[PDB]
Amino acid sequence: EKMTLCISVLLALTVFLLLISKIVPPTS
């Protein structure tokens, strides 16, 4: 992909946000 690295980064950012979010409330 011409932007495979970037999307992987926009998601690395979003996923990182998901986890930093999930950190407090896991089972929810």
Q: What share of the chain is helix, strand, coil (3-state, %, to 5)?
A: 70, 0, 30
Alpha helices of 1-28 — where are they, by DSSP H? 4-22
Distance of CA 7 to the CA centre of its chain: 10
CA distances from 3 to 6, 7, 18 (A): 5, 6, 22
3-state secondary structure of 2: coil
Q: Please, what sign has the CA dihedral across residues 20, 23, 27, 28?
A: negative
Tokens 């998901």 belong to 18
The structure tokens listed for 25 are 């409330």
Q: Could you give the dihedral angle defined by the CA atoms of residues 20, 9, 7 and 3, in that order, rounded to the nearest 10 degrees?
A: 180
